[PDB]
Amino acid sequence: GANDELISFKDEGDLADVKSSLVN
Amino acid sequence: RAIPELTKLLNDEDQVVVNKAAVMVHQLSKKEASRHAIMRSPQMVSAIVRTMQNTNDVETARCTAGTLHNLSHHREGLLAIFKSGGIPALVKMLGSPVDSVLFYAITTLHNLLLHQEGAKMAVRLAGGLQKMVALLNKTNVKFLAITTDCLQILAYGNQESKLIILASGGPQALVNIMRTYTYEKLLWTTSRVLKVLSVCSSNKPAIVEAGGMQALGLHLTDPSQRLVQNCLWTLRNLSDAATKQEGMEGLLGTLVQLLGSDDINVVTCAAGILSNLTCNNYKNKMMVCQVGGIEALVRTVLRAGDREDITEPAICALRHLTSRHQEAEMAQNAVRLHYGLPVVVKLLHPPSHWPLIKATVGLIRNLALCPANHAPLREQGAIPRLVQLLVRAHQDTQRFVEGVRMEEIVEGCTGALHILARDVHNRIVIRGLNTIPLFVQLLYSPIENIQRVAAGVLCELAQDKEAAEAIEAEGATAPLTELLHSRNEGVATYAAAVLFRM
Numbered sequence: 001g002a003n004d005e006l007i008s009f010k011d012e013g014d015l016a017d018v019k020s021s022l023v024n
Numbered sequence: 025r026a027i028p029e030l031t032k033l034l035n036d037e038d039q040v041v042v043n044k045a046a047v048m049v050h051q052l053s054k055k056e057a058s059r060h061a062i063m064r065s066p067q068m069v070s071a072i073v074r075t076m077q078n079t080n081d082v083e084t085a086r087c088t089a090g091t092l093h094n095l096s097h098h099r100e101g102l103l104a105i106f107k108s109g110g111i112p113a114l115v116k117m118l119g120s121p122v123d124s125v126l127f128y129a130i131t132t133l134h135n136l137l138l139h140q141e142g143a144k145m146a147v148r149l150a151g152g153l154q155k156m157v158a159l160l161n162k163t164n165v166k167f168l169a170i171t172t173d174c175l176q177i178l179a180y181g182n183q184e185s186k187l188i189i190l191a192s193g194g195p196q197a198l199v200n201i202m203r204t205y206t207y208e209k210l211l212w213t214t215s216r217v218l219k220v221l222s223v224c225s226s227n228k229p230a231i232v233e234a235g236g237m238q239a240l241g242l243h244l245t246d247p248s249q250r251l252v253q254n255c256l257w258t259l260r261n262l263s264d265a266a267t268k269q270e271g272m273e274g275l276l277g278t279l280v281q282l283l284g285s286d287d288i289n290v291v292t293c294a295a296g297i298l299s300n301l302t303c304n305n306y307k308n309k310m311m312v313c314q315v316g317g318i319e320a321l322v323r324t325v326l327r328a329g330d331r332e333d334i335t336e337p338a339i340c341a342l343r344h345l346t347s348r349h350q351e352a353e354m355a356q357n358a359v360r361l362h363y364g365l366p367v368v369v370k371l372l373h374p375p376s377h378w379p380l381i382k383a384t385v386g387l388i389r390n391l392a393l394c395p396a397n398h399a400p401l402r403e404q405g406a407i408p409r410l411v412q413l414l415v416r417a418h419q420d421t422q423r424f425v426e427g428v429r430m431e432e433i434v435e436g437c438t439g440a441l442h443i444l445a446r447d448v449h450n451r452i453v454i455r456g457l458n459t460i461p462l463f464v465q466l467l468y469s470p471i472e473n474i475q476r477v478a479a480g481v482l483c484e485l486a487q488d489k490e491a492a493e494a495i496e497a498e499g500a501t502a503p504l505t506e507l508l509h510s511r512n513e514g515v516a517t518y519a520a521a522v523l524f525r526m
Contacts, residue, residue, distance in 0.1 A: 001304075002304065003303075003304055003347070003348055004302070004303035004304045004340075004343070004344045004347075004348075005303065006263075006264040006267070006300050006303055007264065007296065007299060007300060007336075007337060007340065008264055009260045009261050009263065009264070009296060009300075010223040010261055011219075011223070011257045011260065011261060012180070012181070012219070012220055012223045012261075013180075013216070013219050013220060013257070014209070015134070015169060015170055015173060015209070015213075018166050018169055018170065018209060019131045019134065019166075019170060021166070022127050022131065022164075022166045022167060022170070023093065023127055023128060023131060
């Protein structure tokens with residue numbers, strides 16, 4: 001079994017303003 | 025000058041005297057003037073780090089954590105906080121029940137990770153991932169945004185750090201972030217963390233079973249492109265591990281629609297996901313077929329031209345949809361009514377590579393199963409090209425190219441011909457390319473599938489008297505006699521037929 005076969009994909013690959021307002 | 029004193033005071037026994045100093049010290053670090061004084065004094069940084077660490081006062085912690093935070097905005101600051109073992113201590117503040125301390129902590133840690141060499145390795149030793157992941161249940165999206173980005177920098181290119189996140193229940197937590205929150209920046213950083221883990225060979229299913237597929241598909245049409253793209257790449261990496269998950273119906277409709285996006289890259293990713301999501305899964309095949317799947321995939325091949333990066337996944341998808349399910353005929357059939365044949369048959373020609381030519385031979389094999397496709401496939405000039413590829417394939421096996429064994433090609437082409445030979449007109453052409461001598465030699469294959477379709481093509485052909493003598497006169501009788509006795513009923517069934525008509 002296992003008719004249709006697969007394709008293998010392995011694409012592994014602005015918080016400064018987020019942080020200041022998280023502290024202040 | 026005050027520095028040397030407070031340093032002294034922070035190392036006092038009278039804790040009262042200490043918190044008193046951390047308050048002052050933390051008021052001095054507000055002004056860059058006094059800030060430098062501090063960074064520049066190892067006894068001051070250690071002092072602080074040791075106080076915040078050992079302290080047990082919910083404000084001496086605030087101020088100490090607060091202080092080294094304001095120290096981490098510069099380069100010399102980070103080194104001072106690093107050389108004094110402040111990381112293990114910051115990881116320790118990640119367990120505070122006091123948000124301020126917590127906030128000041130994840131921010132300083134984020135800063136060290138981003139710019140300080142040695143930080144990443146330090147945070148892992150200190151057990152930072154486990155703690156970081158424990159903090160994914162917090163309801164402050166900005167806190168979550170910085171926390172998740174930490175996991176992404178630690179996990180990137182690190183399987184171990186990846187296995188630790190996974191073992192801490194990380195997947196199901198990030199995946200739940202994608203279900204609940206609408207803050208784009210959070211969704212982004214999280215999606216990026218899911219992206220990095222989806223390449224790991226242990227995380228995939230954890231992400232798929234937690235409902236990752238349906239949750240990454242929730243943001244497929246959000247306005248943010250970076251969000252969309254990340255969600256797509258991640259969905260692509262998870263796809264070969266998602267073929268048996270129920271509830272893909274909506275993500276299927278969305279993916280189809282996206283083939284018509286304006287971004288080739290989006291279209292490419294989507295054709296990829298539909299390709300894998302359609303493997304051996306009848307529920308998925310029919311859903312793709314229901315929402316406009318065939319026409320859209322076909323339109324994608326056309327639009328793509330020579331881009332195998334698109335045509336291939338898309339052609340594989342058309343292949344999957346045209347077989348092994350209640351409406352395979354409806355599909356096979358629909359690819360014509362939507363004008364696919366021209367570009368399909370054209371894909372067997374140069375400059376198509378083998379990976380694609382193989383997949384395209386399979387679609388053709390499948391599409392010939394539908395009688396109304398015989399005439400069309402012929403008039404597009406399929407037989408002649410299917411016939412010469414087989415020849416090139418057969419000769420190689422006598423003379424593992426690009427990851428494609430030529431025997432698979434030998435089987436498909438001859439397989440498509442076995443099927444096309446169900447029409448009398450097609451038969452004439454097949455004979456007309458003096459192929460009979462080649463199929464006969466195909467009887468001597470050590471592979472059963474090959475013998476079956478060789479025998480199979482020769483059975484169709486032999487029902488024509490002259491062609492029957494052509495095969496006989498070719499030596500067929502001998503090898504067929506042996507094929508008569510195979511355990512593969514298919515080969516023996518077709519073995520016995522040629523001889524009979526012969």
